[PDB]
PDB file of C-alpha atoms and ligand atoms in Angstrom:
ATOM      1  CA  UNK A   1      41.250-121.908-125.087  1.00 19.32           C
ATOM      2  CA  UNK A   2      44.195-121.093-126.833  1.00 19.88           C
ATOM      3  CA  UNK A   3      45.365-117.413-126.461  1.00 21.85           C
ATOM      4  CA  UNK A   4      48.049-117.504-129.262  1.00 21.51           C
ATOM      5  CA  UNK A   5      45.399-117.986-132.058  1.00 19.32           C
ATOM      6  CA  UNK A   6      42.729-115.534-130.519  1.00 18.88           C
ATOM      7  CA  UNK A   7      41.510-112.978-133.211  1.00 20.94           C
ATOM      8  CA  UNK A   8      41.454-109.563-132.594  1.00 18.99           C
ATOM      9  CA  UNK A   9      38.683-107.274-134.384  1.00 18.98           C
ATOM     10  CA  UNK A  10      39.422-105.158-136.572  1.00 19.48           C
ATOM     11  CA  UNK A  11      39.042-100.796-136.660  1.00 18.70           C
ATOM     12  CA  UNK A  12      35.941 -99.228-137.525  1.00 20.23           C
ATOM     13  CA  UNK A  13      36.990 -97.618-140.870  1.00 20.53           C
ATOM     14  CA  UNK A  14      35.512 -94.368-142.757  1.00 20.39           C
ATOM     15  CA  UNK A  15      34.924 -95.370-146.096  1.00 23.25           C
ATOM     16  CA  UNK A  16      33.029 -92.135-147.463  1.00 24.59           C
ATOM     17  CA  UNK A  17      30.989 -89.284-146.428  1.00 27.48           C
ATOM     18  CA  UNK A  18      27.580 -87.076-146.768  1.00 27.59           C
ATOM     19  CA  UNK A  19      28.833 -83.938-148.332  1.00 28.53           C
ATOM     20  CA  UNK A  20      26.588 -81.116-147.178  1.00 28.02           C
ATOM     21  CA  UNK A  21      28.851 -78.438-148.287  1.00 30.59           C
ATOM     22  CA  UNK A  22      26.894 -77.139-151.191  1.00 30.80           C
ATOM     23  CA  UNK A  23      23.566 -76.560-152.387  1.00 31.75           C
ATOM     24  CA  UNK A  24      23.158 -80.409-152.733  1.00 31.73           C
ATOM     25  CA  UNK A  25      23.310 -83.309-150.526  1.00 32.87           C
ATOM     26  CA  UNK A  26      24.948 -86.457-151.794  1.00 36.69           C
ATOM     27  CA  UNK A  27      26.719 -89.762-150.842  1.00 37.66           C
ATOM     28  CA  UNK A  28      30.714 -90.379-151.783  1.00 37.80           C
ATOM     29  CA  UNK A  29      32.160 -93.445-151.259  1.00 38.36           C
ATOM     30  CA  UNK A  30      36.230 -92.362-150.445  1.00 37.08           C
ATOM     31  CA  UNK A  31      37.393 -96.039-150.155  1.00 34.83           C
ATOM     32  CA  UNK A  32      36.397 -99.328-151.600  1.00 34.04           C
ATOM     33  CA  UNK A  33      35.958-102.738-150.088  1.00 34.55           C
ATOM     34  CA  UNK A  34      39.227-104.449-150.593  1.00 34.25           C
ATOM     35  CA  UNK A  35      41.116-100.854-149.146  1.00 33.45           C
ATOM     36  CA  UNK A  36      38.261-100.926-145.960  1.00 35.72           C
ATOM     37  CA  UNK A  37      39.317-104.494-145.672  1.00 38.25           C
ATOM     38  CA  UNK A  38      43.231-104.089-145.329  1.00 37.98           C
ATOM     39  CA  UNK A  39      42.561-100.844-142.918  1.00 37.08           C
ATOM     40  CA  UNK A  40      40.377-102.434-140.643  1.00 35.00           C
ATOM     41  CA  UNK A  41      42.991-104.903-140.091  1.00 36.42           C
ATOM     42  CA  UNK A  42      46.557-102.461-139.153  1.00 35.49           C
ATOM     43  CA  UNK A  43      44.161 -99.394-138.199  1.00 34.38           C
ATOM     44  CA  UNK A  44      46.116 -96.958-140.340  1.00 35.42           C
ATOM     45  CA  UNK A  45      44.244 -94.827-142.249  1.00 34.87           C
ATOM     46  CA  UNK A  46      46.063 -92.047-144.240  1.00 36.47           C
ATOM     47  CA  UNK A  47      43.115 -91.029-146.708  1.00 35.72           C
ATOM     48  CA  UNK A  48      41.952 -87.316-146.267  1.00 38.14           C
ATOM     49  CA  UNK A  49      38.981 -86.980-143.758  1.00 38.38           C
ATOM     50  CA  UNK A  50      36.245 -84.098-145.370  1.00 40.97           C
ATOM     51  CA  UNK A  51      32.622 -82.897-143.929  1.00 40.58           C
ATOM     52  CA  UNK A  52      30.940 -83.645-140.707  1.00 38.19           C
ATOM     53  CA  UNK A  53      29.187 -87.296-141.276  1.00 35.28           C
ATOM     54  CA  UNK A  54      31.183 -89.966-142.416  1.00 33.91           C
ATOM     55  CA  UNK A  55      29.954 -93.315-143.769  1.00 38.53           C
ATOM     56  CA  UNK A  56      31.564 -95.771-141.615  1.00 36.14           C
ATOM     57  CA  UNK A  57      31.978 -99.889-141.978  1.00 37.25           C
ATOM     58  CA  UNK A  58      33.108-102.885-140.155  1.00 34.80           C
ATOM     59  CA  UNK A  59      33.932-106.261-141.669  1.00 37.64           C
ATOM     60  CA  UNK A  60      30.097-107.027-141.200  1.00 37.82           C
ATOM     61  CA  UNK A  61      28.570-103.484-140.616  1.00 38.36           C
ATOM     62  CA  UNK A  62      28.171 -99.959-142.174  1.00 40.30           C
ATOM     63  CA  UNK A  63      26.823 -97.243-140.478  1.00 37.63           C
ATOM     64  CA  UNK A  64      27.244 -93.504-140.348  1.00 34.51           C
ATOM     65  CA  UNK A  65      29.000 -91.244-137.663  1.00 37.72           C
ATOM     66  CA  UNK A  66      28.925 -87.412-136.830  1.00 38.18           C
ATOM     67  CA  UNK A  67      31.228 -84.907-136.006  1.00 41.61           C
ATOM     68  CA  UNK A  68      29.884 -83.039-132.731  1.00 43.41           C
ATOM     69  CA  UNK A  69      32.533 -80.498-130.747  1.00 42.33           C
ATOM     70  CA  UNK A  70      35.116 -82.346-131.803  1.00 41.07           C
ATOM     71  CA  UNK A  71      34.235 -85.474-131.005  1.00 39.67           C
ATOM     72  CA  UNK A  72      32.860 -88.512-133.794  1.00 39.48           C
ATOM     73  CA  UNK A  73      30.219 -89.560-132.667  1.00 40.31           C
ATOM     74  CA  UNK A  74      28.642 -93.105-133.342  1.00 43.47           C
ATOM     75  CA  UNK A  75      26.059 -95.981-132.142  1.00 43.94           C
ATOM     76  CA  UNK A  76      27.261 -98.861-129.955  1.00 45.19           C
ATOM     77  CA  UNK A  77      25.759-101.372-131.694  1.00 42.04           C
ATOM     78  CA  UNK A  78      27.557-100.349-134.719  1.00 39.94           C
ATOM     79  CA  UNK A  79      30.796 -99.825-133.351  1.00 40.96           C
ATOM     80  CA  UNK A  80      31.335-101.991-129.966  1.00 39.92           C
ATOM     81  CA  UNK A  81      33.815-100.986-128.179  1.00 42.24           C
ATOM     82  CA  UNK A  82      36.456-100.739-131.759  1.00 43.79           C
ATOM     83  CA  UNK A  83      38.996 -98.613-132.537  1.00 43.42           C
ATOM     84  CA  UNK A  84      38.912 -96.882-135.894  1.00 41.63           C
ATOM     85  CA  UNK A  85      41.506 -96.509-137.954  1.00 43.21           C
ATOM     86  CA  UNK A  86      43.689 -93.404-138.824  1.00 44.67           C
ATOM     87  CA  UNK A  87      46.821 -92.134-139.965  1.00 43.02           C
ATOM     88  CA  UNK A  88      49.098 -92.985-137.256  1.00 44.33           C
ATOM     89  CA  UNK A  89      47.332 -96.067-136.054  1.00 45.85           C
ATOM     90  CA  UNK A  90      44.242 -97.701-134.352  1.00 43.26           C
ATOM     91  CA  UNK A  91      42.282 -94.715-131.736  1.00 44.89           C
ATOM     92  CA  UNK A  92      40.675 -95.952-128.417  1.00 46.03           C
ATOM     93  CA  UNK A  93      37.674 -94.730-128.428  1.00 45.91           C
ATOM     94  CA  UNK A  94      37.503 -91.875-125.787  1.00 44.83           C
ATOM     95  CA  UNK A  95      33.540 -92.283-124.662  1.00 44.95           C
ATOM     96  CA  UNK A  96      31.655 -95.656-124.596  1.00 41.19           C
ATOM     97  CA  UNK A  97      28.454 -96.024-123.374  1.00 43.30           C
ATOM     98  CA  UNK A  98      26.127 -99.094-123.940  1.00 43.07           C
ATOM     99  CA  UNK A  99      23.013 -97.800-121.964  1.00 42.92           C
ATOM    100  CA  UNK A 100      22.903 -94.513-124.498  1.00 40.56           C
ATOM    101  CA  UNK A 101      24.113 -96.891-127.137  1.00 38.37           C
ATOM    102  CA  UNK A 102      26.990 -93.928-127.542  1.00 36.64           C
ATOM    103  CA  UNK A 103      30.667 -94.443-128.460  1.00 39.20           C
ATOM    104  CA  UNK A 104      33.054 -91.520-129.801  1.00 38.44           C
ATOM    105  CA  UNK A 105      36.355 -90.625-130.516  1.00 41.18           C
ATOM    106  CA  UNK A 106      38.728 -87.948-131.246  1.00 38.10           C
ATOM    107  CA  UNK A 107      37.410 -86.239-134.544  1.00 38.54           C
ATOM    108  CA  UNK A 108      39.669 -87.170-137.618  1.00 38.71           C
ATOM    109  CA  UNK A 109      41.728 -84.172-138.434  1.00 36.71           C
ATOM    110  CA  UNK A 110      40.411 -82.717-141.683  1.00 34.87           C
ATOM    111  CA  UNK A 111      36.830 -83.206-140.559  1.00 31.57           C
ATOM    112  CA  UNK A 112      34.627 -80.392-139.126  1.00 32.14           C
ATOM    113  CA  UNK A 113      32.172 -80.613-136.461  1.00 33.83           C
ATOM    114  CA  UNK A 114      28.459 -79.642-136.008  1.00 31.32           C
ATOM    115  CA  UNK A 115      27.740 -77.110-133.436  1.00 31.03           C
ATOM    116  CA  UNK A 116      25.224 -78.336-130.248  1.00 31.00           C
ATOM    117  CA  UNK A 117      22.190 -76.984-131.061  1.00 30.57           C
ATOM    118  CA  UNK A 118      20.981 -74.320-128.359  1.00 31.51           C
ATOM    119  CA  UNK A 119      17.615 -73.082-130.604  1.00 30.87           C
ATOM    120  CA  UNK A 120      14.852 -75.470-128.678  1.00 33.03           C
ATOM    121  CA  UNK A 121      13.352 -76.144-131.639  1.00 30.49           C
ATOM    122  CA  UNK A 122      11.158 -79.007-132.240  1.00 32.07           C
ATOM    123  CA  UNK A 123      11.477 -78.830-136.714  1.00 33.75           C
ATOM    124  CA  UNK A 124      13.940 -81.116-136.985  1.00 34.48           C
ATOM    125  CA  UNK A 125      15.904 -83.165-140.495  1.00 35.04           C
ATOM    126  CA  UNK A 126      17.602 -85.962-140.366  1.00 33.02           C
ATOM    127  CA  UNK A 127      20.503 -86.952-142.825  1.00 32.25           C
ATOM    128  CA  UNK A 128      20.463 -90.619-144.265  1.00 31.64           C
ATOM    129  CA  UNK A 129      23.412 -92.567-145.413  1.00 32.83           C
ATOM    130  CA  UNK A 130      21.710 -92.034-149.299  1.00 34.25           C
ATOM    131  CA  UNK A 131      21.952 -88.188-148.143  1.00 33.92           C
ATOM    132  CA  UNK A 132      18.498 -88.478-148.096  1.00 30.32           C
ATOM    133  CA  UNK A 133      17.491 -85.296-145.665  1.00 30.43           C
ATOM    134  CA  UNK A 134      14.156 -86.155-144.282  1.00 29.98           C
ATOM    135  CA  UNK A 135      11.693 -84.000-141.961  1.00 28.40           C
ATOM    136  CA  UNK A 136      10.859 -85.308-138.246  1.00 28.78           C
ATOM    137  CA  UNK A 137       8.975 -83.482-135.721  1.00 29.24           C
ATOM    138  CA  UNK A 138      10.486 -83.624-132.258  1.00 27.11           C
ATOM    139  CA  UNK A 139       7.867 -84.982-130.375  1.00 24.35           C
ATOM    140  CA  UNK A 140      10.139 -85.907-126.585  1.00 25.11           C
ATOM    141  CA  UNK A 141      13.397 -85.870-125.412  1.00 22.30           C
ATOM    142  CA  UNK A 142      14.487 -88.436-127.905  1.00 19.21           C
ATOM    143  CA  UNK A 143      12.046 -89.444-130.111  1.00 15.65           C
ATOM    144  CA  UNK A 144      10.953 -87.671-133.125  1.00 16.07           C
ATOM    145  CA  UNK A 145       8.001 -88.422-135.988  1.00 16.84           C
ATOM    146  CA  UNK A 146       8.735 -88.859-139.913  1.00 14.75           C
ATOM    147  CA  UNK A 147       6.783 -85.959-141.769  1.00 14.89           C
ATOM    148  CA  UNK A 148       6.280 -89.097-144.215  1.00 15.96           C
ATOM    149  CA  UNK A 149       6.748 -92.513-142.864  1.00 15.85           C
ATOM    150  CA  UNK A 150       9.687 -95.009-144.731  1.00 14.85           C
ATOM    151  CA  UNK A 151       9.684 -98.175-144.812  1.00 16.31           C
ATOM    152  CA  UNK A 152      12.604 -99.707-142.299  1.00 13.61           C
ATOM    153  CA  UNK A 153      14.561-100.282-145.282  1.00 12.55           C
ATOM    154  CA  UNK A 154      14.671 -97.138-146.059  1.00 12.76           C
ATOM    155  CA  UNK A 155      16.488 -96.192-142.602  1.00 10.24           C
ATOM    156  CA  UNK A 156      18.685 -99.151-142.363  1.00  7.56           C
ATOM    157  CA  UNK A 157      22.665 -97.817-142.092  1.00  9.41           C
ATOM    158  CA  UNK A 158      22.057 -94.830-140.962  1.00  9.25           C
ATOM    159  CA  UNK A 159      22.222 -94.681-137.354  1.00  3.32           C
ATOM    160  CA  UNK A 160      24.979 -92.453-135.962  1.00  6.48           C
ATOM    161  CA  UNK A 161      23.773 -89.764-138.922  1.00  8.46           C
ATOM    162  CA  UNK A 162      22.582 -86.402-137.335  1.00  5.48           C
ATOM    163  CA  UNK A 163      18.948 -84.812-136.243  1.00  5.99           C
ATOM    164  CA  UNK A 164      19.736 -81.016-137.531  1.00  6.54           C
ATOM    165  CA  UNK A 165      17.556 -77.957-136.371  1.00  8.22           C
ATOM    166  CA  UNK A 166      16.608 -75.449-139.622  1.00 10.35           C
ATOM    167  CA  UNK A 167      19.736 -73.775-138.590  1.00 10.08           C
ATOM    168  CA  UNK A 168      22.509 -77.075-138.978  1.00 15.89           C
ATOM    169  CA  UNK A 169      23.198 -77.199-135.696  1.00 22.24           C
ATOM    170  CA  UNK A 170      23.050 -80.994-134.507  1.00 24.91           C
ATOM    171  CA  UNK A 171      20.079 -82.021-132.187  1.00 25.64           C
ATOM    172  CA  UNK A 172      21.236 -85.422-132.119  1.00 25.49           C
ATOM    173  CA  UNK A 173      22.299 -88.856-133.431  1.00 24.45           C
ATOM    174  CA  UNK A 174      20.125 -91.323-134.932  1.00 22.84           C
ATOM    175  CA  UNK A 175      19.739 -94.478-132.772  1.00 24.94           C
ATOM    176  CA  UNK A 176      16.846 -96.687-133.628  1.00 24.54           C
ATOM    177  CA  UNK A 177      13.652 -96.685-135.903  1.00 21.98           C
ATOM    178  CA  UNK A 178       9.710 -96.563-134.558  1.00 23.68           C
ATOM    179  CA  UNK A 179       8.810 -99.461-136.199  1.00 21.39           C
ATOM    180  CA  UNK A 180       5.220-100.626-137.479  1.00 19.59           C
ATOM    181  CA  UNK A 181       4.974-103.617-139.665  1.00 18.54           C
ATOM    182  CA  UNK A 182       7.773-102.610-141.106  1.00 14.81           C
ATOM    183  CA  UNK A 183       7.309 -98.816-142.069  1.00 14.75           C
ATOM    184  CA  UNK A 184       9.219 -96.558-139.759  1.00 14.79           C
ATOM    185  CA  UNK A 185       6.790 -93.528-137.913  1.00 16.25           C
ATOM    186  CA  UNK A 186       9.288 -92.551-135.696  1.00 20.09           C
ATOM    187  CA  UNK A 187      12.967 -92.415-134.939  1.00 21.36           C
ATOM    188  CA  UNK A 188      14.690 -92.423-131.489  1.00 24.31           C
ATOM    189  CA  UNK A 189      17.543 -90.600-131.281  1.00 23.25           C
ATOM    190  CA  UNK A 190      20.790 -89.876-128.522  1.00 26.09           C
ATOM    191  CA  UNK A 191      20.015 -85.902-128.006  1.00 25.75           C
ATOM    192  CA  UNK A 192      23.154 -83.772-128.227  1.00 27.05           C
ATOM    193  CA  UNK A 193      22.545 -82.610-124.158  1.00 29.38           C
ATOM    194  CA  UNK A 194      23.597 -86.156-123.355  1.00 32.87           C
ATOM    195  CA  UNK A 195      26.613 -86.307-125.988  1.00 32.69           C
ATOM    196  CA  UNK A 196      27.341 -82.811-123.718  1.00 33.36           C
ATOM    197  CA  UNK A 197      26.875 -84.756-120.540  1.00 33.94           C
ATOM    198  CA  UNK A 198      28.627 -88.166-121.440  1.00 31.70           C
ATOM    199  CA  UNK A 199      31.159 -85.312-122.531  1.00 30.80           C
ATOM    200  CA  UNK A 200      31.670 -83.988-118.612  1.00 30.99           C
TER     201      UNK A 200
HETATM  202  C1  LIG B 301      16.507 -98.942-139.482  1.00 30.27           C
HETATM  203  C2  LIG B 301      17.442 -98.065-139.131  1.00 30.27           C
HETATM  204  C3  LIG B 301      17.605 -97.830-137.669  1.00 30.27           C
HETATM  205  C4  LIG B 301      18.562 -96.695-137.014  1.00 30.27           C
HETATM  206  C5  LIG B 301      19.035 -98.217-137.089  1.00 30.27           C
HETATM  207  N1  LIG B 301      19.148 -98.760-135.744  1.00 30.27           N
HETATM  208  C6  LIG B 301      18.807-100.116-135.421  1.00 30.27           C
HETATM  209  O1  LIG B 301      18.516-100.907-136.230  1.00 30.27           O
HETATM  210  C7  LIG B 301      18.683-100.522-133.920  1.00 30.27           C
HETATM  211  C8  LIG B 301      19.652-101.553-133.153  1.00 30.27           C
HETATM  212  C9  LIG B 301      18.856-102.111-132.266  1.00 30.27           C
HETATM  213  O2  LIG B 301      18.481-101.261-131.221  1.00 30.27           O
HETATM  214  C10 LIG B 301      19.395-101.021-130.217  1.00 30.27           C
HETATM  215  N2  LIG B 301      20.527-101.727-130.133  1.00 30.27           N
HETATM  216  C11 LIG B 301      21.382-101.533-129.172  1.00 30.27           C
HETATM  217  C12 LIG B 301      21.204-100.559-128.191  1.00 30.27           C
HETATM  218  O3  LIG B 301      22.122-100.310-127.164  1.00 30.27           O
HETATM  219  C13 LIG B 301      23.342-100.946-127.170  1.00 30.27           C
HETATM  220  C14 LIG B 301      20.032 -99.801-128.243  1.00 30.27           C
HETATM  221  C15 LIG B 301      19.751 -98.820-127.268  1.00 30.27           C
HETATM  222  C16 LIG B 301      18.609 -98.076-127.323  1.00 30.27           C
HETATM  223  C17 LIG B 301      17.704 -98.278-128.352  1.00 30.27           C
HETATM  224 CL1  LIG B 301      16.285 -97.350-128.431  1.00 30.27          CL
HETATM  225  C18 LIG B 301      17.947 -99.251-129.289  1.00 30.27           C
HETATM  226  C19 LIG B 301      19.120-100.040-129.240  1.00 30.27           C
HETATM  227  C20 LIG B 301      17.599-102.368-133.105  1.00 30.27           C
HETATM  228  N3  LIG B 301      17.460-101.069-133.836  1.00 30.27           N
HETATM  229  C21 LIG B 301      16.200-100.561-134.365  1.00 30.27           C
HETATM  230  O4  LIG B 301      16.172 -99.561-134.942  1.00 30.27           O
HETATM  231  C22 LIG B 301      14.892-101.431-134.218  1.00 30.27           C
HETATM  232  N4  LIG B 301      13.828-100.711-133.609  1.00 30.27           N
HETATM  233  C23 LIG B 301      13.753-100.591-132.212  1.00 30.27           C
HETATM  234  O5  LIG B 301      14.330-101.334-131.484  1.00 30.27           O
HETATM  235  O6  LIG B 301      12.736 -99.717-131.827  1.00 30.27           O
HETATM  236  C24 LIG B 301      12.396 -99.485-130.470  1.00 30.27           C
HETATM  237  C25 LIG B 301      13.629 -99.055-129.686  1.00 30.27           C
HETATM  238  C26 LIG B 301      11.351 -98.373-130.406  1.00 30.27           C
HETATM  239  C27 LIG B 301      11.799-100.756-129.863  1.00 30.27           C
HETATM  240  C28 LIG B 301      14.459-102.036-135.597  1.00 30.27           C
HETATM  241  C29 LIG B 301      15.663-102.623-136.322  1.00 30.27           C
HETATM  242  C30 LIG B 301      13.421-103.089-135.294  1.00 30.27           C
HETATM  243  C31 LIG B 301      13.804-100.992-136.494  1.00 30.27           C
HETATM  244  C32 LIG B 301      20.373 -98.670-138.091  1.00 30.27           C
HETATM  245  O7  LIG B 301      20.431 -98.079-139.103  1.00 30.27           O
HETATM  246  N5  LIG B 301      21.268 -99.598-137.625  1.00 30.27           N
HETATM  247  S1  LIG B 301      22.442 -99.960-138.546  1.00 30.27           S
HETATM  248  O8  LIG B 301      21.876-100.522-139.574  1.00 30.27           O
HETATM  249  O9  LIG B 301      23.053 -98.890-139.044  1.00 30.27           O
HETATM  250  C33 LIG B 301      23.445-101.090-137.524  1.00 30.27           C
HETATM  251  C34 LIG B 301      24.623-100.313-137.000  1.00 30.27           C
HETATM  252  C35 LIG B 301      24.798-101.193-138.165  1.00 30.27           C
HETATM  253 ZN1  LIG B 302      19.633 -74.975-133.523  1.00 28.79          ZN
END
């Protein structure tokens, strides 16, 4: 082929965030589609990163990612192996691995960062993309059951959001819905002991 004309893909850009500061959980979109567009494309990103989960987006994708020691963490199948886009130009990410369906990179500086959860408890809540914050049950290593099953739909765009314990530390990040004709029972997730492992 012809190496001259070869695309390259553009940076995974954050275009909003969960805000969990307050007494209420809500959605805000921090930059719109024709700005996501034009940053995805040089990688340089000076907008003012807030909070610890960020909506992120792709040309084709949107997805959310979570700030864990310092790292933002995301799913593989959202991200690929991309760079996302900051002030002084595309980052590499600095973990990638496709068998956890894990990628991460240096956190943005302005964010903050969930603390690994060290509690062993099994009441867990996990934070949608709508900032919907819904009850699962940890019920294995990485799987965990809705208190009230959602349809798919309902799910959809928020993997790399976090599993929180009662106390908002992160338990881990959402990878993949339990799926039965089309209502999710279940979610799997990427616990935060292998984020700390994949992190040594
Ligand atoms: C509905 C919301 C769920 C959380 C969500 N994730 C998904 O859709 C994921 C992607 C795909 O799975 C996997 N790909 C690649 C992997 O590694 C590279 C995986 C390594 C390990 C495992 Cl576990 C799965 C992997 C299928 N899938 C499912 O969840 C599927 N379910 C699934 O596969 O369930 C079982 C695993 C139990 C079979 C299905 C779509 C059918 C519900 C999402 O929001 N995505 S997204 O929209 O944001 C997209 C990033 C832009
Ligand atoms: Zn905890």
């Amino acid at each position: 082929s012809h190496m001259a004309s070869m695309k390259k893909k553009g940076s995974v850009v954050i275009v909003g965030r969960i805000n969990l500061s307050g007494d209420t959980a809500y959605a805000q979109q921090t930059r719109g589609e024709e700005g996501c567009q034009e940053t995805s494309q040089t990688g340089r990103d000076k907008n003012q990163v807030e909070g610890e989960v960020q909506i992120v987006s792709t040309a084709t994708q949107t997805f959310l990612a979570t700030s864990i020691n310092g790292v933002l963490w995301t799913v593989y199948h959202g991200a690929g192996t991309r760079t996302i886009a900051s002030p002084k130009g595309p980052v590499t990410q600095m973990y990638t691995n496709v068998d956890k369906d894990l990628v991460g990179w240096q956190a943005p500086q302005g964010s903050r960062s969930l603390t690994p959860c060290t509690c062993g408890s099994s009441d867990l809540y996990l934070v949608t993309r709508h900032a919907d914050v819904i009850p699962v049950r940890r019920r294995g290593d990485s799987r965990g059951s809705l208190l009230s099953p959602r349809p798919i739909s309902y799910l959809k765009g928020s993997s790399g959001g976090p599993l929180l314990c009662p106390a908002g530390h992160a338990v881990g990040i959402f990878k993949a819905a339990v799926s039965t004709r089309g209502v999710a029972k279940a979610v799997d997730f990427i616990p935060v002991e292998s984020l700390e492992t994949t992190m040594r």
